[PDB]
Write an enzyme that holds these catalytic residues in place. Structure first.
Site, PDB file in Angstrom:
ATOM      1  N   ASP A  43       5.915 -10.093   6.968  1.00  0.00           N
ATOM      2  CA  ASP A  43       4.893  -8.835   7.002  1.00  0.00           C
ATOM      3  C   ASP A  43       4.100  -8.704   8.329  1.00  0.00           C
ATOM      4  O   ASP A  43       3.083  -8.903   8.313  1.00  0.00           O
ATOM      5  CB  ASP A  43       3.996  -9.291   5.698  1.00  0.00           C
ATOM      6  CG  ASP A  43       2.949  -7.998   5.136  1.00  0.00           C
ATOM      7  OD1 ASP A  43       3.309  -6.758   5.724  1.00  0.00           O
ATOM      8  OD2 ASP A  43       2.558  -8.125   4.111  1.00  0.00           O
ATOM      9  N   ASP A  96      -2.174 -11.082  10.681  1.00  0.00           N
ATOM     10  CA  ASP A  96      -2.167 -11.428   9.314  1.00  0.00           C
ATOM     11  C   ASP A  96      -1.515 -12.573   8.670  1.00  0.00           C
ATOM     12  O   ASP A  96      -0.717 -12.637   7.775  1.00  0.00           O
ATOM     13  CB  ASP A  96      -1.578 -10.159   8.560  1.00  0.00           C
ATOM     14  CG  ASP A  96      -2.242 -10.047   7.108  1.00  0.00           C
ATOM     15  OD1 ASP A  96      -3.454 -10.547   6.805  1.00  0.00           O
ATOM     16  OD2 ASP A  96      -1.500  -9.396   6.303  1.00  0.00           O
ATOM     17  N   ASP A 105       7.421 -17.351  -1.061  1.00  0.00           N
ATOM     18  CA  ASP A 105       6.279 -17.427  -0.089  1.00  0.00           C
ATOM     19  C   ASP A 105       5.571 -18.975  -0.177  1.00  0.00           C
ATOM     20  O   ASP A 105       5.773 -19.456  -1.227  1.00  0.00           O
ATOM     21  CB  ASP A 105       5.466 -16.250  -0.223  1.00  0.00           C
ATOM     22  CG  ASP A 105       4.593 -16.185  -1.296  1.00  0.00           C
ATOM     23  OD1 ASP A 105       3.463 -17.137  -1.515  1.00  0.00           O
ATOM     24  OD2 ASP A 105       4.755 -15.542  -2.281  1.00  0.00           O
ATOM     25  N   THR A 113       0.695  -1.236   0.070  1.00  0.00           N
ATOM     26  CA  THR A 113       0.046   0.012  -0.087  1.00  0.00           C
ATOM     27  C   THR A 113       0.749   1.236   0.044  1.00  0.00           C
ATOM     28  O   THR A 113       0.382   2.181  -0.455  1.00  0.00           O
ATOM     29  CB  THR A 113      -0.787  -0.181   1.293  1.00  0.00           C
ATOM     30  OG1 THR A 113      -1.536  -1.174   1.324  1.00  0.00           O
ATOM     31  CG2 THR A 113      -2.246   1.060   1.063  1.00  0.00           C
TER      32      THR A 113
HETATM   33  N1  LIG Z   1       8.548  -6.843   4.133  1.00  0.00           N
HETATM   34  S1  LIG Z   1       8.210  -8.423   4.350  1.00  0.00           S
HETATM   35  O1  LIG Z   1       6.793  -8.545   3.933  1.00  0.00           O
HETATM   36  O2  LIG Z   1       8.282  -8.773   5.506  1.00  0.00           O
HETATM   37  C1  LIG Z   1       9.247  -9.269   3.120  1.00  0.00           C
HETATM   38  C2  LIG Z   1      10.501  -9.734   3.651  1.00  0.00           C
HETATM   39  C3  LIG Z   1      11.298 -10.399   2.802  1.00  0.00           C
HETATM   40  C4  LIG Z   1      10.798 -10.819   1.641  1.00  0.00           C
HETATM   41 BR1  LIG Z   1      11.833 -11.884   0.524  1.00  0.00          BR
HETATM   42  C5  LIG Z   1       9.671 -10.392   1.054  1.00  0.00           C
HETATM   43  C6  LIG Z   1       8.858  -9.699   1.942  1.00  0.00           C
END
Ligand SMILES: NS(=O)(=O)c1ccc(Br)cc1
Ligand SMILES: NS(=O)(=O)c1ccc(Br)cc1
Lengths: 297, 262
Positions: free
Chosen positions: A146, A128, A87, A15
């Site tokens: 995240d 989340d 992921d 966002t």
């Molecule tokens: N900002 S985060 O959602 O923690 C994130 C960390 C590492 C990777 Br690779 C992708 C996303």
């Protein structure tokens, strides 16, 4: 500031900014760079970023994504994170024909519960948890990522933001609009994730909040007072709901042994108070024989 | 049950005690600030209490903002005319950390009588974040109080309100309260409230939880009792006004006990 990083490719967006995979030209470290635009004439630093940084700065555990640095300008904020290959959602999708081996399921659940135990032990709600927000590498590790929707809680909890957790992974207490929620809402999500790892399919893919409850009910039985004291006294509860029976997990999650089924149900208990903690879940017999396999990437 | 996080309350408490050491301001920083006084800080905090009321913010938000200010002033010397700017920015940061529905930045500019521009508030926000290195999850008096409340039997509305009130009075006066850790002030606030209302002392269940006895809490008690007794005469009254209201059971109208019988 960012002269040491070379952008390699975009890996997704959010966002307040985009995430790029990058490389320290001096060290070789491959990293994930989250760029968060600062609203320097209007709203300042987004509170989602204030929470993500402050909480990540405290949480140092092998199963929680590491924040390595925060690079400031007057106009941008760059969050430097460890890079993980992909992921769980992508992994599951990639594994939708070949299946995911049970040892790795058990491995991944165990690690997720270790991550999560550490959050809870450190008064942080994730709020989340879903496959897209869990990161894996090539060595068979998985990590909570995240933390943008995360929140430091007090004891006891008070009323926090209601619009939390992606619909599919959202605990019934939130759906029924309860005043208070707690650590149990994280466990619910993992429960859904557990199921999903096993079937490579979302356990409760609702197209709305009413539809989300309906999906849960038929699968777990429509809760009464005897299973969940207060369910009928809860707001958003309607005496009008159909009275579905609980389905045998032997049909809900066929591949799963009797231990898995048992852990799954405790993770999916209706009553938040009866639902197993991450800490207790770590002790469950499902994990007696847990190993750390590498995934077939 | 799960709202009191049974499987975690100990782990949580242990870590808040470790984190409250880390977020602790420098006890003597006021002597090192050339243009700022305890008096001025009092006036600032008192104003934040008012701001807290006007916008119906959590008390936790007020405690956080004071933590932020104290740490900022432990590292940065500030001229009096910019003291309020630090405070406004801290309240803003605390609001964004803690509140479901923080006020917009404009609202925080509004409350300073346009002493400052929005550009200044946003920029001070950034500076405060840099100085604290984004360590905002500070343990407060309140985080400890709510934990200590669980040991009541039964839970007493007046005790809860009165311990909050005492806890907030401490926010105002850097001398002496900067020398006490949050968990200590909270324990004193709760002993002193529980004694005043019911006659009882610090339970042993909490002696077991905290490792604190009345012996160890005595210094902090002596100060707090004194602050309580002198509260009608204090130059800052916003907290007394606040805790007259129905919402807090009019605890600030209760007569303080004259002795602590220790
Ligand atoms: N900002 S985060 O959602 O923690 C994130 C960390 C590492 C990777 Br690779 C992708 C996303
Ligand atoms: N003091 S800071 O530059 O905001 C910072 C925040 C988090 C990490 Br992890 C590293 C640095």
């Amino acid at each position: 500031s960012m002269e040491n990083f070379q952008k390699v490719e975009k890996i997704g967006e959010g966002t307040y900014g985009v995430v790029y995979k990058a490389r320290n030209k001096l060290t070789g470290e491959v990293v994930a760079l989250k760029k968060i635009r600062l609203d320097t004439e209007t709203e300042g630093v987004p509170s989602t970023a204030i929470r993500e940084i402050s909480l990540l700065k405290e949480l140092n555990h092998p199963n929680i994504v590491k924040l390595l640095d925060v690079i400031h300008t007057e106009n941008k904020l760059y969050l430097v994170f460890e890079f993980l290959h992909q992921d769980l959602k992508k992994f599951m999708d990639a594994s939708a024909l070949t299946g995911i081996p049970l040892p790795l399921i058990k491995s991944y659940l165990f690690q997720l519960l270790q991550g999560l135990a550490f959050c809870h032990s450190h008064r942080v709600l994730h709020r989340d948890l879903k496959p897209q927000n869990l990161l894996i590498n090539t060595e068979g590790a998985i990590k909570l990522a995240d933390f943008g929707l995360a929140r430091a809680f007090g004891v006891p909890v008070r009323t926090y933001t209601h619009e939390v957790v992606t619909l599919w992974y959202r605990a019934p207490e939130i759906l029924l609009g309860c005043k208070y929620y707690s650590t149990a809402v994280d466990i619910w999500s993992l429960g859904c994730i557990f199921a999903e790892m096993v079937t490579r399919r979302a356990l409760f893919p609702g197209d709305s909040e009413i539809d989300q409850l309906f999906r849960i009910f038929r699968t777990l039985g429509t809760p009464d007072e005897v299973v969940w004291p207060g369910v009928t006294s809860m707001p958003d509860y309607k005496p009008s709901f159909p009275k579905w029976a609980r389905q045998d997990f032997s049909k809900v999650v066929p591949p799963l042994d009797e231990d898995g089924r048992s852990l799954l149900s405790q993770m999916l208990h209706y009553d938040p108070n009866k639902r197993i903690s991450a800490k207790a879940a770590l002790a469950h017999p499902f994990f007696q024989d847990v190993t750390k396999p590498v995934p077939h990437l | 049950g799960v709202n009191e996080v049974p499987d975690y309350h100990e782990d949580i408490h242990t870590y808040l005690r470790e984190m409250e050491v880390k977020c602790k301001p420098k006890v003597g920083y006021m002597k090192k600030q050339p243009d700022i006084t305890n008096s001025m800080r009092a006036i600032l905090v008192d104003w934040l209490v008012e701001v807290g009321e006007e916008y119906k913010l959590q008390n936790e938000t007020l405690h956080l903002a004071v933590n932020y200010i104290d740490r900022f002033l432990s590292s940065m010397s500030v001229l009096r005319g910019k003291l309020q700017l630090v405070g406004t920015a801290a309240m803003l940061l605390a609001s964004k950390f803690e509140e479901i529905y923080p006020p917009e930045v404009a609202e925080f500019v509004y409350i300073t009588d346009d002493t400052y521009t929005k550009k200044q508030v946003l920029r001070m926000e950034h500076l405060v974040l840099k100085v604290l290195a984004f360590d905002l999850a500070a343990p407060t008096i309140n985080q400890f109080l709510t934990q200590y409340f669980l040991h009541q039997q039964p839970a007493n509305c007046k005790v809860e309100s009165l311990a909050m009130f005492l806890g907030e009075l401490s926010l105002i006066d850097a001398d002496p309260y900067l020398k006490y850790l949050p968990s200590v002030i909270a324990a004193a606030a709760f002993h002193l409230a529980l004694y005043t209302v019911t006659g009882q002392s610090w339970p042993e269940s909490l002696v077991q939880k905290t490792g604190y006895t009345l012996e160890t809490l005595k210094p902090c008690l002596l100060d707090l009792h004194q602050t309580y007794l002198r509260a009608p005469q204090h130059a800052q009254q916003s907290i007394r006004e606040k805790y007259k209201n129905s919402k807090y059971h009019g605890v600030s109208l209760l007569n303080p006990p004259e002795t602590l019988n220790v």
